[PDB]
Symmetry: D2
């Protein structure tokens, strides 16, 4: 006895067909399609193939001089011809990923109100309190399997962008489709608008959100609770909810509460941890060594930092068979007050305590790098230019091949650049970054730095959950995904300095990740699509959305 929306169904014809992104083929409508659907005359005589349409659009797209104009033309395409959008992205993913994802999506979010054109996603605000379920009914695709949701509090390293954070889930789900093969009709981008503490946006006449400060405490928790309950009631038990770009306290609390009642994943805490782990398994495959033999130092000890560290420690426990507390002993984190150490146990946030070992207090990253002498440095602070020449030279002075992960996004917030990491280390850093850098020529050799970004993981991980009918996420699924990504890494990639295969392999990578995730769901008793298929890799491959145009009756 929920209220229901009454939907009418009809055959799309004429301009109705041309104006529906899900069906519009533009000039690719065939002769017969045109004569059966009243398109004759509404289009010019010539029939153009999907492949020529891609070429035409790529031609005009490269004439836009700024990355933001290219993001704009891509989103406009997504909202006019969805299959072309996805075939174009897939076939040009290496070139286009920086424009629809990091870094450009970050700029899109900062300027979202000033470029806002065709509506994308669903906005749920404080003003919908008591009527969330009401709002969800307005979404015209009934069969939702993947939700990506943000409150915009922590967009990349750019801070609080409020209701303009919508570009992040819209981005993420396009990658679920393009990289992961998830059907776009079952994807739902959501922004929850509870206000913003961003003064500049509160005073901007184009800000698209509620002009108030962020709600906190009960007012916030009640809205989230109503949302999560509405999702369960409307979409069932198997809907994947992916949390994106919440602040530390909220992100942890949400994962703690809803991972017992729903199928949830936090991309920053769990996705990032998984991709970094894979990058470490591959880095050790190129330069030798075990995960247990390393000493880890993190700059930044919130969601991503502590989550990556926990996953690394967890995999150390699996490979050594030692208790988890032992496996944390060579993982150290530095926050804004400095090294996290026993003498501060007095007053650390809960998620940092397990990392506080007995050690002298140290104020700065540089002093901690000097005293701890890590084999591995991982930056997630969200603060640019924080891996200095002095730091990379130190890391290069006491390791032959220092592993440097500069994970903060977008590009301007990167801890260092690939250029700086290879030069300041004399060609010896194993380097990966959150955001893309071009190849670096150093002293006559080419380095191709891998992008340690959770886009390698979430698309296949989510596909794995969906094809298996998983109802909960378990940490062993994260380790299974990390291992499936590292296992795709080859000698070809390593010779170029790349810890990951390139994104031209992404569909195949996603199919192996999904297969390993699904297998793990079956093994733990968390899968509801029983029985398992006979070949999970083949099944994942066969499940994947293809954006080649349909023929229409």
């Amino acid at each position: 006895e929920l209220p229901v929306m009454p939907w009418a169904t009809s055959v799309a014809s004429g301009y109705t067909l041309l104006r529906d992104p899900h069906h519009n083929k533009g000039l690719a409508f065939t002769e017969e399609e045109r004569d059966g659907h009243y398109l004759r005359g509404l289009l010019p005589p010539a029939v153009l193939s999907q492949e020529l349409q891609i070429k035409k659009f790529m031609n005009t797209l490269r004439q836009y001089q700024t990355p933001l104009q290219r993001y704009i033309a891509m989103m406009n395409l997504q909202e006019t011809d969805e299959r072309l959008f996805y075939k174009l992205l897939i076939d040009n993913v290496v070139e286009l990923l920086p424009f629809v994802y990091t870094p450009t999506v970050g700029e899109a979010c900062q300027k979202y109100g000033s470029i806002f054109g065709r509506p994308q996603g669903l906005y749920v605000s404080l003003k919908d309190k008591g009527k969330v379920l009401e709002v969800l009914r307005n979404w015209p695709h009934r069969n939702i399997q993947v939700i990506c949701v943000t409150d915009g509090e922590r967009i990349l390293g750019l801070g609080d962008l409020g209701c303009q954070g919508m570009g992040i889930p819209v981005g993420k789900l396009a990658l679920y489709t393009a990289l992961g093969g998830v059907d776009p009709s079952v994807c739902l981008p959501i922004t929850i608008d509870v206000g913003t503490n961003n003064e500049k946006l509160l005073n901007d006449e184009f800000y698209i959100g509620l002009r108030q400060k962020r709600a906190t405490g009960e007012e916030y928790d009640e809205l989230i609770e109503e949302f999560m309950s509405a999702v369960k009631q409307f979409y069932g038990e198997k809907v994947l909810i992916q949390f994106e770009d919440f602040a530390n306290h909220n992100a942890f609390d949400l994962l703690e509460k809803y991972s017992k009642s729903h199928l949830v994943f936090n991309d920053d805490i769990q996705g990032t941890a998984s991709v970094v782990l894979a990058g470490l398994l591959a880095a050790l495959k190129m330069v030798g060594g075990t995960l247990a033999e390393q000493t880890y130092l993190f700059l930044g000890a919130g969601e991503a930092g502590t989550g990556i560290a926990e996953l690394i420690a967890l995999e150390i426990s699996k490979q050594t068979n030692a208790p988890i507390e032992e496996c944390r002993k060579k993982v150290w984190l530095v926050d804004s007050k400095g090294l996290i150490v026993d003498s501060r146990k007095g007053s650390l946030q809960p998620f940092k305590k397990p990392w506080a070992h007995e050690h002298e207090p140290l104020k700065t990253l540089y002093d901690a790098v000097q005293s701890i002498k890590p084999t591995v440095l991982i930056g997630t602070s969200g603060v640019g230019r924080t891996f200095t020449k002095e730091i990379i030279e130190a890391m290069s002075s006491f390791n032959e091949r220092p592993i440097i992960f500069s994970l903060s996004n977008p590009t301007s917030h990167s801890e260092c650049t690939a250029e700086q990491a290879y030069t300041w280390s004399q060609g010896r850093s194993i380097f990966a970054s959150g955001s893309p850098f071009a190849p670096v020529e150093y002293e006559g050799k080419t380095f191709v730095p891998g992008q340690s970004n959770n886009a390698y993981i979430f698309p296949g991980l989510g596909l794995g959950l969906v094809i298996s009918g998983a109802v909960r996420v378990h940490e062993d699924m994260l380790l299974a995904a990390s291992k499936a990504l590292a296992d795709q890494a080859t000698q070809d990639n390593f010779e170029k300095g790349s810890i990951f295969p390139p994104f031209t392999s992404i569909r195949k990578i996603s199919a192996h990740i999904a297969a390993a995730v699904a297998a793990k769901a079956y093994e733990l008793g968390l899968a509801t699509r029983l029985p398992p298929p006979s070949d999970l890799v083949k099944y994942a491959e066969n499940c994947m959305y293809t954006p080649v145009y349909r023929n229409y009756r």
Copy 2:
């Protein structure tokens, strides 16, 4: 690859409002649209000011329905309602099942098929003809409900006792599916009535200016087989492996061949063969609970040895096999059949159609039913011959002379073709016969008692059996599911029915009867490994009840 290239329908959706909402029978509530729904969907002024509950709409509709003078007028008004307010139709039907069943199923539905062209109003169901050869799948694509789970299909060749009515047989699957919804709780949106038009041999219909089908004699042999094969392969491709295909009112030889060809490859069921077997078995099981005895201890005599009749026999034998652990060849030996030529016996084997041979036991030839009844001395006598009044006074008296409580089933429909009347069975046995029939008879008063004879209607079985297949994800029908349905139906027969002589519970309990049958069928499907909705829920009765469609209006704001 090649099936990815197949053209699809570009369906679009939009919010229904105004007359688009009022003209869609799936959503239309008429005067039951609340003030709030009217204000939110642009209905204000299109309806008068008053809001009428679903219960008052039912009462309103019943009052006018009862003022129509002929059964067929009532059929027409009921079909019109189905096609304008679907939830009102289903709720009206459920709450008045005993009174309305004769207007919307048997016998009125037969009369509607006879006259279907002359009363054709609002379209119902999907017609597939010989002219759609090579493009059957393109026709299925025109049906605007995408997830079909139950199909009831006919070629119209043998509609009740009325013969070949060609394309005008659509009244049958339309009626059956209404019962699947009302009695079984199958959601009407997942039900698809289909008529396959391959011509008709009914000369009257071929000359009737109002006949709605192809104006030609039936296709036979290869042309027919190929169209059917294209239909069955298109059904599988478009709706998947789990769709139920119920065959209805095919000619006899055809009905068996389709069932044997397609039981290997699809989920299929024929109501006239499998359903009837199961309801008769349920009846024997209830009768024996009423008078004592086991199925194994009986001796059974059938008048009529049609292929459909031998399937009743075979199911009785199979159940005797389960209760006894004896091979089925041993259990057939107390089941006898009489033909036009007399008792089916071993010495006739050479001149017997093959389906009769399993029943051809060692015995002296007997030319007549009466001689067979006196020689064999059955405890149970079952009529499927299609000839009225073959259970004579001499027969009923013989049956009553060597049985305390003779069990007598006159299954031939309609009433004029009944082997005997209820009045006769009870009068000629001095009140002692356990009686049931295919056609409805009024109660009988005899000396002291009042007798309400049970009616061998396979609507007692098909709705819960299909529900059971659907809720388990069953992929094949197995004969043990038919046994499980029969036992579940007989277990619902209370002492209240037995006091009045009724071996079946009344249709007022049908929704609960369906859920028990569905549970027993589902449980069998899990047991035989034929279920795909895994794992099974722990309480299948409860689960079956909660899967049942309820036609209470939805709220729209």
Copy 3:
């Protein structure tokens, strides 16, 4: 244009959307090519049946329903499922079907409307829509409205106050505009204004569809009507025809008075009935000799409808003789509930009865008035059945050779007398006509076929005349012109059977002539806006007429 608007989407109809749309649905007449191009294959059975065979099929089942009301029900259901089929069936079987979709069966339908309510028809505007009438009009999905027929249900035929169940009347009236007058049904809007009802039986009926209150009156009533009339002008413009039906007599007059100056309006009961009666009298005198001025007229019922008929007779006498209108009233008498309207009562009459208050001894009963005045014409508007008694008709037949008797009250059960009674009690000599239909009467070897003096002969052509000439006001001379056009169609073929009007089988030809004469008169008076006038108005009217023959669809 701070005026909100309803955004309407437009698309090509197919599949079920086509089948369930009564305006486009052809049922089994969709052709092979239409089916293949509109996703209908399989949704319909293989055969293609013509429009004519659909009509035959439907008439066959129709004639098996045992009650008139069941036939009305089947016909409304057909109007709401296949419009073109409905209108063609009705036009080709008009004599047979009229008594089932119009008087008398429509009366019973209104009395039982809640109990038989199926497919929605028309637009309901209630007191609860106050302040929001325009918003309700926006919900009607046909934008170009040219003819509104509106009631408040207060005086439905002679049946009284039926409240919101009065809807049946405008709905039936508009069907006749289309079937009989050729107005396109898409441009017709039936409306019921629900302000409550004084019928206690309906207020206590669980199936009553209206507001469960007594009728609003005074300023409250007038405010709703004003908002309504202002909304119709703003939304449909200056040229929309508003036909008022079945208002109480006081409201009927006041609304005609007030809105005649501001809108194109027509009251069917006061003007339509006046015009069909005049035409009947013009025919009747062509058949038995004499002049309108030399008759003596007696009315039973002095409502603003009886006085309306009387006023138009006096007006045409004025035109024919040149005498002032006042003197043309001297031989026109009316009997109300307290008796004959006479000068000695004048001080205490309602003002509208005063022009008829001639000097005469006061008389209490109709019969006394019939014996004292000795009319040549007796016209009944009472709403009370069987008031033209044997004694009255015998009297009329003793001092007139051919007494003219019009028994106008509907439905049949409220008719002043029956045709059997008229011809029997007059010995075959009455020229009789009635509001409701009667079967042929056999008397001493002669067959009498009584005419129907019902405004269905007039309103269809008259509104078509207003519409095609772009008229902006109704003038009394249009009513005289319509009367004369109808009487000019009466021939000796129909007089020989005793019918003062041509049969309904000629109604399209009659309506074209009425429309031509109404339009000519609009141009002649400076009331027409479709300029310049076409030169052959009768031909133009015929060519303007809706045909319900199916369209072919691409």
Copy 4:
């Protein structure tokens, strides 16, 4: 009234501010042809905004 809640973000922008917003991005296109493409796109997305923008910035 028209089932838009959630499909749009919370803020309501006036016709005038939409004009200003579109003019600001229009000026940042480098070529005349790009300005044409953006205008044609607006004519086919929001007809009234297109014509009002054009009339006020003719």
